[PDB]
RNA sequence: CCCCACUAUGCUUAGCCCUAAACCUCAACAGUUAAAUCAACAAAACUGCUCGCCAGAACACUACGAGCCACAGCUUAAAACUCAAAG
RNA sequence: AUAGGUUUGGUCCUAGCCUUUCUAUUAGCUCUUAGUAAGAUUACACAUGCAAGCAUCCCCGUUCCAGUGAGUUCACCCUCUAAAUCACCACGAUCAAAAGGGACAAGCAUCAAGCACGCAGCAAUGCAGCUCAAAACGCUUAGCCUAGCCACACCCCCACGGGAAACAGCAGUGAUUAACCUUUAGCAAUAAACGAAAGUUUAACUAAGCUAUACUAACCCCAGGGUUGGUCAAUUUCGUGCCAGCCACCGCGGUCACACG
């Protein structure tokens, strides 16, 4: 009943959370828009046709 | 045949004949009886016939027996509140003991029927499902309703094979 | 098998012999007839006035084969098979 | 025994059922290696057509060709099955007629 | 089982065989399969008319009122079954879908009339 | 009052007292054999906390579950010593007894 | 169904779902119906919620329940 | 196998070895002689309670493993293949 | 089991094997229709296509459904108590993870010792214990207790990192095995996601396609397979001559074969 520890599962969890706080994208990158294709270059997703 | 003396004791029909269903307070039951002596005769018969019946109805109650520790037999119960119930069972038959503890610590017939009645409401007859839980699996088993296609083929107008063909 | 069959079928006690032996009424209880007591045999001699002492637990030797069946434990793919009329 | 002894032991432990030459499988695919004949044990006497095959599991056992006459050669493919050859001791496999290279016994 | 987030929902669980559907009303987690595990069965619905030409619908109102008071949601088809009964109000789209049908049928009466009149 | 321990009240027998302020108790329960339909004693060991170290090997004791385990295996505490080894007092009469005999006649105190 | 790591199809790359047309009359009438229907149902839900809270408190802390817990404790003594 | 001769050994002392048809092949405690006494033979048939042991033959007083002052040993003790009998 | 056959020159006892019943898989021979259910052998490798989007931008969702059975006492009860639903504060309810206690597969004792597995104390630190023939420790095997649950998601238990470039999603293919379903349609129903909503999307699902694997029903025309010494229902005539061959058990065949063809 003694669970075998998983240390790599906790190490990566801390590293991921840390990098998400140090490499976090800014509002300038996230909410940018190309006004010709009307796509956010960060994700390459088109906006809805009613917002164009 | 079945080994041992009085083999009927080792039967489900005999273990379910006990009428002593303790309450929630009772936690431990300790029996102290003497192997010899005319006075302790009933206590010995109570350990030989009824303890199996009591433990079968109260499986979460600890029962511990001690031999020849005192000059006289007695019973002692330990409740959850910390109270102890001493019961001198000297010069008494096994039935008197079985009837005496049922009056001071056992449930009555009114408290038992209620519990059973609650269970009956767990199996609703209207529900449909497997035979283990429900009486009927589907509603095609009800006369008047559309039968199962496995037994009675449906009309060609009610099958999606022809509805598509008729439409196209 | 044959010498024993005839042996047990001849040493069986009827309802009349039982009544005469114990001087009591032999009453038959049937589920189909409800609680109606049916007297199948009565003693010819003096009927006893005292009843038999009711026994809390009977000291009768049982058969594991019968007890195991009554408890839904005797599994067999050869019992209760559909056979011809006999 | 006693009730205390029967409780300590527990339910009878059924011996693990042993597997046959097919390793608990209906049939098996093998390649022919040799084609010899063996003499049966008493009270019988004959020359029974047998063949040594290498099964797909890796073993290399002896099999019996049923029927009158066969045209089995080395490197051919045959399907085998169970069934003891009572006359031949130690022969537990039988070739299947009409499957793969093995061809149905010619009539008469 | 434990689902991340989610909630309880009173929906329909399809049953029956091919071309013979039979729904059974149940209260189940939102992420659980359609015909998978459920908390309680609260009714049944037989779409196909019976010999008498009527669709049967069972509802355990006493229990439907219990789960709605414990945080359970409702599916659109199930909200249209409670409106047909009088337990809930008529769903807005049950009303608008009827108006669309009226205008549609009135639009077909014109063409039918014109053909018989003009021709 | 509510505790995280399964067994709240249990009676046992002290088998060992080699740990500081701790008594090792053996608890027996009747368990039904499904096949033979007979009850047999299934024993189990429990660790009890004895503040005064008054327990003795061979005496019957009563254990009370603690609110939370004070240690890894200690979950109960010594509630009272039911039968002291060799010095049991008859609960029915309150007199000392050595087996099935009274050491002090009950008639002394009427 | 797909996962976050699975890629997208090449037939949906140049796909644009145009929103449906709007009937000004029906759209406004239907926009009020949901407003009332959802207000009538929010009240019903609150009613049923009060009934589940009551029974529970009643069961553990009720007149009849506490009138029987004392009778069982008095009969025990 | 019969006759003669002679040795280890049989004996004492100090240690080891720990086996037998070590079988009266019939376990210990208590109790019974009536009922169905009872397959056969043998040393009549049974009850209560408890421990130990056995589950087709052969492979097998074997192999491996482990333990032992035992080193060609003792104890514990299987499996594969084979038979439709063995007893 | 209502039992039966078989040890022998013969009898009784004991005993094993086998037969008779009911299912599943594969093989041989054979095969008309309709409805329904079910449907790789392999955690080996995979061409192509599709399976997650919604929406006035943000968020939400893609952590679900679906799939597999590699590994395997995390699945149940109690206590306590997060997240989530009940529009919202609160309430308590519902649901439920982590933590604590208890319970929980099979075989092997030729696995009998494990080797730090304990307790006290605020701490310092002290004591020397803890488990086990009532089976500890250990090996091997196996998905389970099926309205469903547990576990896994190419491999290194994990996944920062590395090997390395992944169908155990649908259809389909290679290899492999005795084991072999279409590289269909549609979101109309239900369910799920998103949206205030009309609605959009979904290889979930629904409706079809294929297969005597099974159930039900039917058919003017349309039946084959096995068996025929005894157990065990049922053989005429030839050929063969301990040769060729047959048998589930007992056995048949040596020139009169109800047992081979
Ligand atoms: S089972 Fe009810 S329709 Fe097939
Ligand atoms: K012969
Ligand atoms: K002897
Ligand atoms: K959105
Ligand atoms: K598995
Ligand atoms: Mg000499
Ligand atoms: Mg000598
Ligand atoms: Mg001797
Ligand atoms: Mg002996
Ligand atoms: Mg002895
Ligand atoms: Mg043997
Ligand atoms: Mg020897
Ligand atoms: Mg040896
Ligand atoms: Mg050796
Ligand atoms: Mg799943
Ligand atoms: Mg948990
Ligand atoms: Mg070995
Ligand atoms: Mg496995
Ligand atoms: Mg289909
Ligand atoms: Mg002839
Ligand atoms: Mg012939």
Read off the tokens for B12. 């489900």
Classified as helix, coil or strand, D17 is: coil
What technique determined this structure? cryo-EM
The answer to whether B93 and B38 are in contact (CB under 8 A) is: no
Cα dist from B82 to B15, F49, G69, whole Å: 30, 18, 19
| DSSP type of residue F16 | E
Q: What is the spatial distance between Cα B114 and Cα C19, in angstroms, rounded to a whole number?
A: 45
The neighbouring-strand residues paired with C68 are none
- Closest atom of ligand 1 relative to the B147 alpha carbon: 3
Map C23-71 to HEC letters: CCCEEECCCCCCCCCEEEECCCCCCCCCCCCCCCCCCCCCCHHHHHHHC
- Answer whether B4 touches D (CB < 8 Å): yes
Q: Please give the C-alpha separations between residue G47 and each of E83, E85, F19, G36, in angstroms, as whole numbers.
A: 18, 19, 61, 17
Reading the block at residue F12, the tokens are 């046992």
D63: nearest Cα among D55, D73, D53, D76: D53
* Polymer length of chain E: 119
Tell me if B1 and C61 make a contact (CB, 8 A cut-off). yes
Distance (Å, whole) CA B85 – CA F9 = 14
Side by side, the strands of the sheet bearing B74-79 are B62-67, B26-33, B74-79, B84-88
- If one counts the domains in chain E, the total is 1
Domain residues of chain B, as ranges? 1-164
Between CA C78 and CA C86 the distance in angstroms is: 18
How many Å apart are CA E95 and CA E89, to the nearest integer? 11
In angstroms, rounded to a whole number, what is the distance separating the alpha carbons of residues F77 and F47?
8
SS3 G42: helix
Q: What is the 8-class DSSP label of residue E30? A: S
CB atoms within 10 A of CB E63: 17
Q: How far is G47 from chain E (nearest CA, A)?
A: 8
The answer to whether B52 contacts chain F (CB < 8 Å) is yes
Collapsed DSSP state (helix, strand, coil) of residue A24: coil
Residue with tokens 């949901």: G34
Chain B residues closer than 8 Å to C71 by CB: 11-12
Q: Which residue of F has its CA nearest to D2?
A: F36
Q: What span, in angstroms and rounded, lies between the C-alpha atoms of G62 and F87?
A: 50
CA distances from D57 to D18, D25, D94, G20 (A): 17, 11, 17, 65
Let me know the angle formed at the C-alpha of E85 by E80 and E89, rounded to the nearest 5 degrees: 60
Alpha-carbon gap, residue B8 to C59, rounded angstroms: 8
Q: Which of E11, E88, E86 is nearest to G40 (CA)?
A: E88
Nearest nucleotide from residue B1 CA, by C1' atom: H47
Q: Which two tokens stand for residue E60?
A: 């355990």
Q: How many CB atoms lie within 10 A of CB E102?
A: 9
> Following CA atoms G52, G58, G59, G60 in sequence, which dihedral angle do they give, to the nearest 10 degrees?
110
E contacts of B154 (beta carbons < 8 Å): 19-20
Dihedral Cα B64, B65, B66, B68, nearest 10 deg = 170
Per the listing, tokens 């042996």 go with: C7
Q: How far is B11 from chain F (nearest CA, A)?
A: 6
CA distance B4 to chain C (A): 9
User: Could you tell me which of D38, D69, D67 has the C-alpha nearest to residue D52?
Assistant: D38
Residue numbers in G near E69 (CB within 8 A): 45, 47-52
Q: How many domains does chain F have?
A: 1
CB–CB of F31/B55 below 8 Å? Answer: no
**Per CB distance under 8 Å, which residues of G are interface residues toward A?**
16-19
Cα separation, D96 vs D83, in Å, equals 11
Pocket of ligand 1 (CB under 6 A): B 138, 140, 148, 150; E 16-17, 20
| Strand I atom within 7 Å of F69 CB | yes
Are C62 and B12 in contact (CB < 8 Å)?
no
Segments of chain B assigned E as strands: 26-33, 62-67, 74-79, 84-88
Return the partners of chain E (3 or more C-beta pairs < 8 Å): B, G
Q: Which has the closest alpha carbon to B76: F11, C82, F8?
A: F11
**Could you tell me the resolution of this structure in angstroms?**
2.6
Strand spans (E) along B13-163 = 26-33, 62-67, 74-79, 84-88
How far lies C16's CA from each of C21, C27, C39, C41, C48, in Å? 8, 11, 11, 5, 15
Q: Do residues D95 and D64 make contact, with C-beta atoms less than 8 angstroms apart? A: yes
Helix axes G24-60, E92-118, angle to 10 degrees: 150
What is the SS3 assignment for G9?
A: coil
C-beta neighbour count of C56 within 10 angstroms = 9
Q: Please answer whether residues C39 and C27 qualify as being in contact, where contact means their C-beta atoms are separated by less than 8 angstroms.
A: yes
How long is chain A?
A: 52
Domain span at F17: 1-109
Domain range spanning residue E41? 1-115
Asked if the Cβ of residue D90 lies within 7 A of any atom of strand H, the reply is yes
Residue among B83, B74, B94, B92 at smallest CA distance from B23: B83
Q: Which of B7, B13, B49 sits opposite C61 (nearest CB)?
A: B7
Q: How far apart are CA B25 and CA F12, in angstroms?
A: 19
- The protein residue nearest I80 (Cα–C1') is F4
Protein residues placing their CB within 5 Å of the ion ligand 2: D 43-44
């Amino acid at each position: 009943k003694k669970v075998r520890p998983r240390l790599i599962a906790e190490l990566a969890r801390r590293v991921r959370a840390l990098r998400e706080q140090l490499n976090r994208p800014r509002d300038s990158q996230l909410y940018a828009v190309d006004y010709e294709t009307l796509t956010r270059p960060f994700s390459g997703r088109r906006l809805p046709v009613r917002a164009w | 045949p079945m080994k041992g003396r009085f083999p009927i004791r080792r039967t489900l029909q005999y273990l379910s004949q006990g009428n002593v269903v303790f309450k929630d307070s009772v936690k431990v039951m300790t029996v102290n009886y003497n192997t010899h002596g005319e006075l302790g005769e009933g206590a010995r018969k109570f350990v030989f016939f009824n303890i199996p019946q009591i433990q079968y109805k109260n499986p979460w109650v600890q029962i511990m027996m001690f031999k020849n520790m005192t000059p006289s037999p007695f019973l002692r119960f330990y409740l959850d509140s910390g109270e102890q119930v001493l019961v001198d069972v000297e010069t008494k038959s096994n039935k008197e003991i079985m009837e005496h503890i049922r009056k001071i610590l056992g449930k009555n017939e009114e408290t038992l029927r209620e519990e059973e009645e609650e269970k009956k409401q767990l199996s609703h007859p209207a529900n449909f499902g497997p035979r283990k839980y429900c009486l009927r699996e589907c509603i095609c088993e009800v006369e008047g309703q559309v039968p199962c296609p496995s037994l009675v083929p449906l009309p060609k107008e009610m099958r999606g094979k022809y509805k598509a063909a008729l439409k196209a | 098998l044959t010498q024993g069959l005839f042996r047990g079928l001849s040493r069986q006690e009827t309802h009349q012999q039982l009544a005469d032996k114990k001087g009591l009424h032999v009453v038959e209880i049937r589920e189909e007839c409800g609680p109606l007591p049916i007297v199948v045999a009565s003693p010819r001699g003096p009927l006893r006035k005292d009843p038999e002492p009711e026994d809390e637990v009977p000291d009768v030797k049982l058969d594991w084969e019968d007890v195991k069946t009554a408890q839904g434990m005797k599994r067999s793919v050869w019992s209760n098979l559909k056979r011809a009329a006999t | 025994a006693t009730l205390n002894q029967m409780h300590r032991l527990g339910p009878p432990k059924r011996p693990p059922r042993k597997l046959g030459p097919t390793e608990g499988r209906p049939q098996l695919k093998g390649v022919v290696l040799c084609t010899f004949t063996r003499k049966p044990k008493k009270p019988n006497s004959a020359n029974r057509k047998c063949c040594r095959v290498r099964l797909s599991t890796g073993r290399e056992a002896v099999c019996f060709i049923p029927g009158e006459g066969h045209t089995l050669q080395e490197h051919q493919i045959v399907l085998v099955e169970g069934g003891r050859t009572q006359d031949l001791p130690g022969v537990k496999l039988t070739v299947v007629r009409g499957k793969y290279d093995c061809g149905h016994v010619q009539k008469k | 089982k434990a689902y991340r987030g989610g909630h309880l929902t009173i929906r329909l669980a399809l049953g029956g065989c091919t071309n013979r559907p039979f729904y059974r009303i149940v209260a189940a987690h939102n992420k659980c399969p359609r015909d998978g595990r459920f908390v309680e069965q609260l009714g049944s619905y037989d779409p196909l008319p019976n010999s008498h030409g009527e669709k049967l619908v069972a509802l355990n109102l006493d229990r439907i009122r219990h789960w709605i008071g414990c945080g359970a949601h409702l599916s659109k088809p199930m909200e249209k079954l409670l409106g047909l009964a009088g337990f809930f109000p008529l769903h807005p789209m049950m009303i608008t879908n009827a108006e669309r049908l009226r205008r549609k049928r009135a639009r077909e009466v014109l063409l039918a009339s014109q053909k018989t009149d003009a021709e | 009052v509510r505790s995280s321990v399964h067994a709240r009240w249990i009676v046992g027998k002290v088998i060992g007292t080699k740990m500081q302020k701790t008594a090792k108790v053996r608890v027996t329960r009747l368990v039904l054999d499904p096949y033979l339909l007979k009850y047999f004693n299934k024993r189990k060991t429990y660790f009890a906390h004895d503040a005064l170290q008054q327990c003795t090997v061979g005496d019957i004791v009563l254990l009370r579950a603690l609110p939370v385990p004070r240690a890894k295996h200690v979950k109960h505490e010594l509630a009272e010593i039911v039968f002291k080894v060799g010095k049991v007092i008859d609960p029915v009469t309150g007199k000392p007894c050595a087996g099935t005999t009274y050491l002090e006649s009950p008639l002394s105190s009427e | 169904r797909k996962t976050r790591h699975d890629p997208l199809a090449k037939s949906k790359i140049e796909r644009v779902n145009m929103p449906p047309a709007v009937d000004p009359a029906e759209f406004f009438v239907l926009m009020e119906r949901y407003q009332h229907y959802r207000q009538t149902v929010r009240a019903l839900r609150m009613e049923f919620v009060s009934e589940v809270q009551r029974k529970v408190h009643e069961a553990r802390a009720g007149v009849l329940a506490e009138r029987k817990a004392l009778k069982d404790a008095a009969e025990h003594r």
